[PDB]
């Protein structure tokens, strides 16, 4: 619905603990969907070269995310992925995608271009003084 | 040990603010946690008042600041 | 069942502490409405790490 | 003790924990979370 | 409200939520003063000096 | 912007505040210009300023939510505006006078 993050519907007949763990993991998929929409929108020439380069850099991290998700799929095919193991292993990916979705949302809400995008990126980089990753 | 770790982790942003304050006189306290506040109107002053009021250390509650 | 209930009550108290502490530490983002400051936000990040370690320990507990 | 030892002799009578914790963390912690040694 | 820009309008809505019923033209001029990178402490001192003489 | 935009803005503010006499407009201009830095060097603790306004705001939740909204938009002068509002909330007399002028205006 609009420029909102993607929401997911989980089957109500799933176990409550399973359903809650899915809802904890789904934020990664919501962030990925938000980042992909941001990447696809801000990759337009009209968004300027800084926003295009930002979208390409985000696309590289989304590609790494797809590699990670493909690894989780491969582990699942091997039966090595439990919901608790997925939740633990996705914690870094969940945080990365949440940061990417927050940046995507901030760039899109501020209509940042050129020096305003660099200003926003500087303020975000300062805002992450406590998170080295 | 866990309390020491948590104290270190919580001081890390505060230690960064302290570093910026000490090296550049830049108050990097986003939440007003540092004992020094900068009143920029007098920081632009080119007299004694620049030093006294441009950046003000909260002195009354030194223990709290 | 009464003694088992007592043991389970103690275990439930520990689980209650875990879940409530996780919720308290779960205050995630130092957003502009976060008034506790960056030291508190970093503390909550460390607490999230601690709770992650706790979850890891719980999962490391063999069900046998 | 000296008496007992002498009597028996005459009668011919009668970091590693940190490493274990690190291995446990590696087996149960996600790769990217730095172990805190005081917390560890 | 037409005196204030959309960003200035959003700041005016925020100021109203802050409890400040400010005139949109006064808020617009204040935003223009803030756009000139004037220190807000000096702007506050200026406002105080301008208001102190006007007894209700 | 015009070199003398500050003089127009000050004259408008004097007219809007019904300040009798342009005697001293030069003093207000000189105060603002002497304390006007071309760079936003004042790292204002917006969190504490937000807190002061929320204690001052009749709608503190709305103030905090709007601050986080404007920050997510990277809205310029947000923290300066919140600081200005906090300083007006500190000066109850100035705030009452401004409210009465706004009502009269």
Curated annotation (Swiss-Prot), chain D:
User: According to its UniProt record, in which tissues is this protein expressed?
Assistant: Widely expressed, with highest levels in heart and skeletal muscle and moderate levels in brain.
Could you say which residues form the signal peptide? Answer: none
* Location within or outside the cell: Cytoplasm, Cytoskeleton, Microtubule organizing center, Centrosome
Q: How does it assemble?
A: Component of the gamma-tubulin ring complex (gTuRC) consisting of TUBGCP2, TUBGCP3, TUBGCP4, TUBGCP5 and TUBGCP6 and gamma-tubulin TUBG1 or TUBG2. TUBGCP2, TUBGCP3, TUBGCP4, TUBGCP5 and TUBGCP6 assemble in a 5:5:2:1:1 stoichiometry; each is associated with a gamma-tubulin, thereby arranging 14 gamma-tubulins in a helical manner. Gamma-tubulin at the first position is blocked by TUBGCP3 at the last position, allowing 13 protafilaments to grow into a microtubule.
Can you tell me which family this protein belongs to? Belongs to the TUBGCP family.
Q: What does this protein do?
A: Component of the gamma-tubulin ring complex (gTuRC) which mediates microtubule nucleation. The gTuRC regulates the minus-end nucleation of alpha-beta tubulin heterodimers that grow into microtubule protafilaments, a critical step in centrosome duplication and spindle formation.
Q: What is this protein called?
A: Gamma-tubulin complex component 5
Record the organism: Homo sapiens
Swiss-Prot record, chain E:
Please state the span of the N-terminal signal peptide per the UniProt entry.
none
At which residues is Phosphoserine found?
5
Specify the domain of life of the species encoding this protein.
Answer: Eukaryota
Q: Where in the cell is it found?
A: Cytoplasm, Cytoskeleton, Microtubule organizing center, Centrosome; Cytoplasm, Cytoskeleton, Spindle
According to its UniProt entry, the function of this protein is described as: Required for the recruitment and the assembly of the gamma-tubulin ring complex (gTuRC) at the centrosome. The gTuRC regulates the minus-end nucleation of alpha-beta tubulin heterodimers that grow into microtubule protafilaments, a critical step in centrosome duplication and spindle formation.
Q: Which family does it belong to?
A: Belongs to the MOZART2 family.
Assembly behavior: Associates with the gamma-tubulin ring complex (gTuRC) consisting of TUBGCP2, TUBGCP3, TUBGCP4, TUBGCP5 and TUBGCP6 and gamma-tubulin TUBG1 or TUBG2; within the complex, interacts with TUBGCP2; the interaction plays a role in gTuRC activation. Interacts with TUBG1.
For this entry, the protein name equals: Mitotic-spindle organizing protein 2B
Identify the species of origin. Homo sapiens (Human)
Which span of the entire protein is present here? 30 to 85 of 158
Curated annotation (Swiss-Prot), chain F:
- Tell where it localizes: Cytoplasm, Cytoskeleton, Microtubule organizing center, Centrosome
Which domain of life does the protein's organism represent? Answer: Eukaryota
- In which tissues does this protein get expressed? Ubiquitously expressed.
Role, per record: Component of the gamma-tubulin ring complex (gTuRC) which mediates microtubule nucleation. The gTuRC regulates the minus-end nucleation of alpha-beta tubulin heterodimers that grow into microtubule protafilaments, a critical step in centrosome duplication and spindle formation. Plays a role in neuronal migration.
What disease does the Swiss-Prot or TrEMBL record associate with this chain?
A: Cortical dysplasia, complex, with other brain malformations 15: An autosomal recessive disorder characterized by global developmental delay, variably impaired intellectual development, speech delay, facial dysmorphism, microcephaly, and varying degrees of cortical malformations including pachygyria, thin corpus callosum and subcortical band heterotopia. Most patients have generalized seizures.
Query: What quaternary arrangement does the UniProt entry report?
Result: Component of the gamma-tubulin ring complex (gTuRC) consisting of TUBGCP2, TUBGCP3, TUBGCP4, TUBGCP5 and TUBGCP6 and gamma-tubulin TUBG1 or TUBG2. TUBGCP2, TUBGCP3, TUBGCP4, TUBGCP5 and TUBGCP6 assemble in a 5:5:2:1:1 stoichiometry; each is associated with a gamma-tubulin, thereby arranging 14 gamma-tubulins in a helical manner. Gamma-tubulin at the first position is blocked by TUBGCP3 at the last position, allowing 13 protafilaments to grow into a microtubule.
Protein name per its UniProtKB record: Gamma-tubulin complex component 2
Q: Which organism is it from?
A: Homo sapiens
Q: Top-down, what is the taxonomic lineage of the species of origin?
A: Eukaryota, Metazoa, Chordata, Craniata, Vertebrata
Q: Which residues of the full protein are shown?
A: 1 to 105 of 902
């Amino acid at each position: 619905a609009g420029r909102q993050s993607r929401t997911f519907l989980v089957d109500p007949n799933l176990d409550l603990s399973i359903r809650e763990l899915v809802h904890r993991i789904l934020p990664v998929a919501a962030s990925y969907s938000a980042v992909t929409r941001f990447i696809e929108e801000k990759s337009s020439f009209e968004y300027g070269q800084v926003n295009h380069a930002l979208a390409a850099a985000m696309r590289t991290l989304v590609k790494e995310h797809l590699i990670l998700v493909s690894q989780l799929e491969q582990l699942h095919r091997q039966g090595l992925l439990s919901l608790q193991k997925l939740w633990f292993y996705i914690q870094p990916a969940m945080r990365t995608m949440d940061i990417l979705a927050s940046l995507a949302t901030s760039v899109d809400k501020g209509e940042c271009l050129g020096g305003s995008t660099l200003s926003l990126l500087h303020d975000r980089s300062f805002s992450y003084t406590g998170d080295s990753q | 040990p866990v309390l020491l770790s948590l104290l270190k982790t919580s001081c890390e942003p505060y230690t960064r603010f302290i570093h910026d304050w000490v090296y550049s006189g830049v108050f990097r306290d986003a939440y007003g946690e540092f004992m020094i506040q900068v009143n920029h109107e007098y920081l632009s002053f080119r007299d004694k008042l620049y030093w006294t009021h441009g950046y003000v250390l909260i002195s009354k509650e030194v223990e709290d600041c | 069942p009464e003694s088992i209930s007592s043991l389970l009550s103690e275990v439930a108290e520990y689980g209650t502490c875990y879940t409530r502490l996780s919720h308290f530490s779960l205050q995630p983002v130092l957003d502009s409405l976060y008034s506790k400051g960056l030291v508190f936000q970093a503390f909550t990040s460390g607490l999230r790490r601690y709770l992650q370690y706790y979850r890891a320990c719980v999962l490391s507990t063999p069900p046998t | 003790t000296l008496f007992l030892e002498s009597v028996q002799s005459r009668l011919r009578t009668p970091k590693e924990n940190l490493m274990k914790m690190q291995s446990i963390a590696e087996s149960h912690l996600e790769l990217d979370d730095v172990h805190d040694p005081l917390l560890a | 409200k037409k005196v204030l820009s959309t960003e200035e309008m959003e700041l005016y809505e925020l100021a109203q939520a802050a409890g400040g019923a400010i005139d949109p033209d006064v808020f617009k001029i204040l935003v223009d003063l803030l756009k000139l990178n004037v220190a807000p402490l000096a702007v506050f001192q200026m406002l105080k000096s301008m208001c102190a003489g006007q007894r209700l | 912007m015009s070199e003398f935009r500050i003089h127009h803005d000050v004259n408008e503010l004097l007219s809007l505040l019904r300040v009798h006499g342009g005697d001293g407009a030069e003093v207000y201009i000189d105060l603002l210009q002497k304390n006007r830095t071309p760079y936003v060097t004042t790292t204002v603790s917006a969190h504490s300023a937000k807190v002061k306004i929320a204690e001052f705001s009749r709608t503190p939740e709305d103030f905090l939510k709007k601050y986080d909204e404007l920050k997510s938009k990277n809205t310029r002068n947000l923290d300066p505006l919140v600081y200005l509002l906090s300083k007006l909330t500190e000066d109850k007399e100035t705030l009452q006078y401004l409210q009465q002028n706004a009502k009269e205006r």
